[PDB]
Design a protein around this ligand. Structure first.
Ligand SMILES: Nc1ncnc2c1ncn2[C@@H]1O[C@H](COP(=O)(O)OP(=O)(O)O)[C@@H](O)[C@H]1O
Ligand SMILES: Nc1ncnc2c1ncn2[C@@H]1O[C@H](COP(=O)(O)OP(=O)(O)O)[C@@H](O)[C@H]1O
Ligand code: BEF
Ligand code: BEF
Lengths: 152, 221, 170, 198, 384, 266
DNA sequence: GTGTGTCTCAATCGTTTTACAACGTCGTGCTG
């Protein structure tokens, strides 16, 4: 719960890792390590992931370093001090029995706009999709123009 | 070390009387008005403000090293130089230098930083038609009582007319855009308060315009 | 010194946890991909296989067998479909925040666009979507519609509700 | 989820434009062929991504509005998130972010708190976001992305969604810190042995 | 004249000897996704000999189930059906062929180029999702493209080699005269006179070499500039009328503008051909922060402007309408409809029914699941 | 006056902006209009920037106002009309040397690429304005029309662009010898104009003319002692005198460069 | 009740590293 409140030392080390090295003086530096390790080793807060564990590891090692440095400084001082439509087309074809060519399936389909343009091209795209999924076997290379036979 | 010393003397003596005995030392800091360090620039602007507050008789020959800072790249020098122009404007009485305050203010209506375009307006507002006295509320102009005609509104009124008389098409547009931007103020009360002051002005000029029906070529214009 | 040895223990346990997390997340995303892709097409197999390292997206557009159909030799439409299946499965395993889609209807057909629309309906039930198109299939699923217009050298945004699904399709 | 956005001064967006508190489910945007969609998504990416970083003078000027009204100096985008606990500072139920850009300044922020860049980077990193080119965002016509890249990059994206890159980075950094401490500890031991003798 | 037939066996996803039929003016490829519908453009690009990397594949064994070949037949406005056949021999090599006689690339490319088909710089082709990156690349490669259309690359090689010869000669002669003024300036001893005589003769030799090299340079530069200036002059006078024809919709009867500028009028190869465009309701911005639709329109206008210089016999378009609304796709459809003639053959692949709904011939492509052979049919749009 | 007032409607949103911002900053609670102007300038551009060099001040000043507006709104490609700004930078009265510098310092602040080499082209225009035949001998000391150009670009660490423009001026300084016999008086009068424009300009550094003197000694070495046995021999041609006079103009400048800063030794 | 004296927020002036763009180096794919 270290993100929410300031109870556990996990919150303090989280602040140390999250914000910066500062805003944690000597008087609040002297915290615990074993508690922090046994708090990170168990399952973390509301985000169940690993990223927060990585940040916490950075924080604990930074605190470790700073405390060791302070100990070094004190020891140096102590030394100094002691030194002293695809359906609509599928339906028309589903009904009509084999054999049937394209010209005739077009003949029984009249698009609402009356143009032998969009009706025909939509009919064509349609028979393409139908042939694309196992409806019709077709044949056109017999050197006869517009001679596609269409059969289930 | 040069930064520290001029930073120290900015509050050290609290008496510009040292410069009553050392005008050559004052001449030293006048030379550093164009240093590259943006920090030392404002220090010169602060010291030179203080020197006018007491040793007032140096309005003209000092004035030059003041407006030379408003057209500078740093914001600190501009945001400081402006506030000194405020104090100088009241203590001075030559209208011919008052107009030079205004032209250099309106020119900085827009700037690269937003805050310069912010401060520049209220410091202008504070001068032109927002006096700081009594008898400024709940009344109109009347006939030559309490000597407000030639002693109060002559700072509220006079430097206007000589700034709006420029036939240059820049002046006639730089003003009118600024006035509307001044209207959208901080909205504690935004309309009625500014009204009362300028309704006085709009009637005040009007009294001098009632002179046109009680009377001269350029004056009317 | 005791603090030092404890943080060494911490590094070890966290490394172990990382490795098990990698394994389980790979397994889950693989299963999710296979399910979504078999849902999209009436007949096909899709699966991911990690290489021998610690990936190769063996796609197949048929049911019986592949003919070593090498990726980026298939089509534009098929690989666009594969990319969408990938991101949608990754988000199915773990909910991602506020995903955004700019003109996914590029080289698809009617049927694929309808199947995209239905699965993105379900994914909208689970998470947050914003997208842009021009076609009638993606439009019928948002239940919250917008609109932009450009006039006087400025672009403005508005909010409209029904007219767009008949005005900017047909 | 995220509720409403304000953009002003941005490219093809002069004045003060706000979008409604949009719905948490699917949303669509429709308009003309060349107006204000790619710019909208570019603004959303601008406020929250790793892009527009290695900019320059003409770049940090390229993304302002150039028009006849008046020379514009700065621009800002601000988003509003209605989180519950996904973002770590759960004390704030409605977090807000904004990034202002002048011709010679940029500042990230939090709820009017003007923090530096590294902190908002760390904030978005603790949340479930990704710093680099994010998979959940696809720009114009770039949809054929994660189907033709080199497959080691696909392993990279998978290790990204599992969250391990930053883990390795901080682990190595911690190792460096450990080396500094091991030298300092050797010093400490020698000095205290001298103490003990004296 | 135009493309007439294509007979191909065992191409990628085409098993058996298929025959692709009549190609009238402005034919349209059509079919569902993922089944044919661009292997035809691929086979055209393979006949028109090109590297595999521009195609979707990355080798030459990967287009098959045995060794294959593509054979194209072309008309030359005088009845002659000249055929070009390119095969793939085992182990990965290849053999080109014209009229069933084995011929190396040289005469292939030559007798192909004589019909205004530049293959070293392919321009008549466009690939899926590459229309908008024709007007957005740096200016140096646009200059490279227009220069490849000029056909002056040996001129470029002689140019830059001669420039290296000529900075070398001039800087060496500069330091040479520096040392001469140095040495002779101290003269007032055999040392200075040997230095005089030998350095003078050395500098005279370097001078003769420099003068000769200047001549060679002036020759190659004169030829290169003749060709480049001819090309640029004829192209940069024709882009704005066709751009205004492209972008003048009924909504905006003042379409827009387009400019091709360069920095040094005398030495143009340094700064690339900068190119900018202005849609109807828009101010001046460079080709970087422009959007997708205007990028597409500008690229198509640029290609048509190229076509105004040297006409190509055919023109193959893939999905050029990826990011366009209805207005301008209807506009470009009307343009292509009223511009195709005996000199131009537009073969267009697209899905939007409004676009190809008014073609002359259609080639639809299906995929029989039994053989996985993406077979195809074709039909006319004249009886209706 | 009609054209300028027409364009002014789009720019009148400067205080009509605040007339509208009184409903925008403080909110209330055929589509040709935007595209009539941006076309009818390009159909009449090539006369606009020709009028600016006339002696009729009212005509001129009321031409430069239009040019001040077009670039400010960006209605025509600035690339086509940038080669006339520099020709208005110096060769006029003082009343216009402000605005030209202002536009020339506006584009270089935020565009930097649409204008980077055009100086080489535009310098042909200035020399094309003033006539020089047996008169107006380009003696050193005059106001070089780029006196401000180097200043405006040098307001940064421009270790590159400062070098770029001077390259665009020295383009005829070296003698490429496009055809060694054929050079005309106006053609070498051109290069003599380019000499003085390099002379009278101060610099922030000292290194950049040291390569310039390195170039002029090359042409001194390369082609000079060719004609050395020509002038002294019966002088009956114009091939050399159209060049040798030009060649001896280089020692003039090179001598002025040794005194340009009095720091070069030889 | 008025001056106090201490705590907390904003610009700016050297460093630093860090992204970026130019330049040889190989290795696969062909064609003669
Ligand atoms: N810096 C800019 N300032 C103003 N407008 C811009 C800027 N950059 C691009 N634009 C304009 O923004 C529009 C782009 O809108 P976009 O959303 O890109 O169009 P599409 O609808 O194709 O996505 C174009 O008109 C473009 O010119
Ligand atoms: N060498 C090959 N042998 C058999 N099939 C192939 C071969 N190479 C590619 N394919 C298949 O051919 C089909 C390509 O069809 P294409 O015409 O490329 O699709 P699009 O409709 O996007 O143009 C894909 O299924 C691809 O996998
Ligand atoms: F690859 Be093909 F154009 F669909
Ligand atoms: F129309 Be945007 F560029 F997708």
């Amino acid at each position: 719960e270290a993100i929410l409140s300031k109870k556990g030392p996990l919150a303090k080390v989280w602040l140390a890792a999250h914000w910066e090295k500062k805003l944690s003086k000597v008087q609040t530096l002297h915290t615990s390590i074993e508690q922090s390790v046994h708090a990170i080793v168990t399952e973390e807060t509301a985000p169940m992931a690993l990223r927060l564990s990585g940040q916490l590891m950075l924080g604990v090692v930074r605190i470790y370093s700073r405390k060791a440095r302070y100990l070094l400084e004190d020891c140096t001082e102590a030394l100094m001090r002691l030194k002293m439509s695809s359906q609509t087309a599928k339906d028309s074809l589903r009904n009509k029995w084999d054999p049937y060519t394209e010209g005739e399936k077009v003949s029984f389909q009249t698009l609402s706009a009356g143009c032998n343009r969009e009706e025909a091209v939509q009919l064509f795209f349609d028979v393409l999709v139908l042939a694309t999924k196992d409806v019709i076997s077709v044949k056109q290379d017999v050197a006869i123009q517009n001679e596609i036979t269409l059969t289930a | 070390l040069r930064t520290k010393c001029l930073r120290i003397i900015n509050q050290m003596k609290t008496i510009p009387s040292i410069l009553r005995t050392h005008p050559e030392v004052l001449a030293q800091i006048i030379s550093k008005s164009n240093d590259q360090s943006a920090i030392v620039r404002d220090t010169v602007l602060d010291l030179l403000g203080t020197y006018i507050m007491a040793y007032r008789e140096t309005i003209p020959q000092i004035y030059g090293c003041i407006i030379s800072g408003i057209s500078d790249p740093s914001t600190i020098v501009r945001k400081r130089a402006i506030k000194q122009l405020c104090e100088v404007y009241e203590a001075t009485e030559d209208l011919n230098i008052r107009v030079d305050i205004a032209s250099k203010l309106l020119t900085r209506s827009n700037d690269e930083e937003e805050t310069i375009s912010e401060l520049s307006l209220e410091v202008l507002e504070k001068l032109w038609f927002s006096p700081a006295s009594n008898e400024l509320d709940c009344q109109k102009g009347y006939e030559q009582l309490t000597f407000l005609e030639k002693q109060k509104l002559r700072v509220q009124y006079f430097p206007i007319l000589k700034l709006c008389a420029e036939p240059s098409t820049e002046r006639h547009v730089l003003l009118v855009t600024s006035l509307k931007t001044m209207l959208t103020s901080k909205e504690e009360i935004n309309l009625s308060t500014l009204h009362t002051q300028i309704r006085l002005l709009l009637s005040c000029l009007f009294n001098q315009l009632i002179e046109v029906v009680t009377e001269t070529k350029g004056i009317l214009y | 010194r005791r603090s030092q040895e404890s943080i060494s223990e911490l590094t070890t346990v966290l490394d172990q946890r990382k490795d098990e997390a990698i394994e389980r997340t790979f397994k889950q995303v693989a299963k999710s991909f296979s399910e979504i892709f078999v849902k999209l097409v009436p007949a096909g197999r899709g699966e991911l296989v990690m290489n021998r390292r610690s990936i190769s997206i063996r796609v197949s557009f048929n049911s019986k067998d592949d003919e070593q159909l090498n990726i980026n030799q298939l089509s534009g439409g098929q690989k666009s479909l594969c990319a969408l299946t990938l991101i949608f499965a990754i988000q199915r395993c773990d909910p991602a925040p506020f995903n955004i889609l700019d003109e996914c209807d590029a080289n698809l057909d009617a049927q694929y666009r309808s199947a995209i629309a239905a699965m993105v309906k379900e994914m909208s039930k689970t998470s947050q979507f914003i997208c842009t198109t021009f076609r009638p299939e993606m439009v019928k699923v948002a239940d919250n519609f917008y609109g932009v217009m450009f006039n006087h050298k400025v672009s403005t945004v508005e909010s409209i509700s029904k007219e767009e699904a008949m005005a900017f399709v047909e | 989820y995220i509720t409403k956005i304000v953009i002003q001064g941005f490219k093809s967006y002069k004045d003060y434009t706000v979008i409604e508190p949009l719905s948490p489910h699917h949303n669509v945007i429709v308009g003309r062929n060349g107006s204000g969609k790619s710019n909208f998504f570019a603004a959303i990416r601008f406020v929250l991504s790793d892009a527009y970083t290695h900019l320059s003078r003409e770049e940090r000027q390229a993304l302002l509005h150039e028009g006849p009204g008046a020379t514009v100096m700065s621009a800002y985008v601000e988003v509003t998130f209605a989180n519950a606990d996904n973002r770590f500072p759960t004390g704030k139920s409605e977090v807000v972010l904004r990034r202002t850009i002048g011709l010679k300044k940029d500042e990230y922020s939090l709820d009017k708190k003007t923090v530096s860049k590294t902190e908002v980077i760390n904030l978005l990193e603790s949340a479930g976001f990704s710093r680099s080119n994010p998979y959940y965002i696809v720009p114009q016509g770039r949809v054929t992305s994660l189907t033709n890249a080199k497959d080691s990059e696909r392993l990279e994206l998978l290790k990204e969604v599992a969250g391990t890159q930053i883990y390795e980075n901080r682990r190595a950094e911690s190792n460096k810190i450990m080396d500094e401490t091991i030298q300092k500890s050797e010093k400490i031991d020698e000095l205290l042995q001298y103490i003990e003798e004296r | 004249g135009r493309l007439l037939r294509l007979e191909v066996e065992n191409f990628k996803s085409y098993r058996g000897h298929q025959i692709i039929g009549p190609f009238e003016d402005f034919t349209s490829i059509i079919g569902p996704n993922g089944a044919g519908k661009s292997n035809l453009m691929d086979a055209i690009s393979f006949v028109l000999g090109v590297k595999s990397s521009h195609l979707r594949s990355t080798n030459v064994k990967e287009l098959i189930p045995t060794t294959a070949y593509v054979k194209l037949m072309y008309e030359l406005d005088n009845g002659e059906q000249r055929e070009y056949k390119r095969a793939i021999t085992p182990s990965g090599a290849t053999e080109y062929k014209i009229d069933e006689e084995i011929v190396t690339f040289s005469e292939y490319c030559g007798s192909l180029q004589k019909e205004n088909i530049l293959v070293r710089a392919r321009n008549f082709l466009v690939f899926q999702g590459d229309v908008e990156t024709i007007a957005s690349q740096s200016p140096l490669e646009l200059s490279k493209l227009v220069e490849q259309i000029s056909g002056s690359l040996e001129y470029k090689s002689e140019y830059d080699k001669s420039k290296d010869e000529q900075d070398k000669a001039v800087n060496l002669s500069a330091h040479s005269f520096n040392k001469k003024r140095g040495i002779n300036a101290e003269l007032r001893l055999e040392t200075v006179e040997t230095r005089l005589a030998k350095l003078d003769e050395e500098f005279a030799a370097a001078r003769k070499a420099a003068k000769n090299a200047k001549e060679r340079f002036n020759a190659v530069k004169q030829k290169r500039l003749q060709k480049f200036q001819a090309a640029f002059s004829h192209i940069s006078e024709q882009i704005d009328p066709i751009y205004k024809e492209l972008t003048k919709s009924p909504a905006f009867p003042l379409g827009g503008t387009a400019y091709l500028t360069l920095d040094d009028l005398d030495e143009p190869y340094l700064g690339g051909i900068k190119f900018h465009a202005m849609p109807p309701m828009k101010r001046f911005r460079d080709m970087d922060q422009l959007s997708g639709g205007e990028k597409t329109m500008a690229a198509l206008a640029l290609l048509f402007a190229i076509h105004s210089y040297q006409p190509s016999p055919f023109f193959v378009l893939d999905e050029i309408d990826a990011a366009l609304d209805q207005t301008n796709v209807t506009k470009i459809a009307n343009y292509i409809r009223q511009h195709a003639s005996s000199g131009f053959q537009f073969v267009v692949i697209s899905l939007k029914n409004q676009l190809f709904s008014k073609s002359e011939a259609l080639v639809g492509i299906y995929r029989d699941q039994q053989e996985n052979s993406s077979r195809t049919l074709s039909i006319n749009l004249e009886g209706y | 006056k009609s054209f300028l007032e027409l364009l002014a409607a789009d720019e009148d949103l400067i205080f009509e902006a605040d007339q509208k911002l009184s409903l925008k900053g403080k909110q209330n609670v055929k589509q040709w209009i935007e595209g009539v102007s941006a076309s009818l300038m390009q159909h009449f551009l090539p006369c606009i920037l020709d009028s600016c060099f006339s002696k009729n001040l009212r005509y001129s000043m009321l031409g430069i106002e239009i040019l001040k507006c077009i670039i400010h709104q960006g209605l025509v490609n600035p690339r086509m009309c940038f080669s006339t700004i520099i020709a208005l930078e110096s060769n006029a009265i003082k009343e216009t040397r402000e605005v030209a510098i202002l536009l020339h310092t506006e584009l270089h602040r935020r565009h930097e690429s649409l204008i980077d080499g055009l100086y080489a082209q535009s310098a042909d225009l200035i020399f094309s304005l003033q006539k020089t035949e047996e008169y107006q001998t380009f003696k050193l000391g005059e106001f070089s029309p780029f006196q401000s150009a180097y200043t405006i670009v040098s307001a940064d660490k421009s270790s590159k662009s400062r070098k770029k423009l001077i390259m665009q001026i020295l383009k005829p300084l070296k003698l490429d010898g496009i055809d060694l016999p054929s050079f005309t008086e106006e053609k070498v009068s051109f290069v003599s104009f380019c000499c003085v424009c390099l002379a009278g300009i101060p610099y922030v550094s000292i290194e950049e003319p040291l390569m310039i003197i390195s170039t002029v000694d090359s042409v001194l070495a390369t082609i000079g002692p060719t004609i050395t046995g020509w002038m002294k021999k019966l002088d009956h041609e114009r091939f050399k005198i159209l060049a040798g006079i030009n060649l001896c103009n280089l020692i003039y400048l090179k001598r002025y460069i040794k005194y340009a800063f009095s720091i070069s030794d030889s």
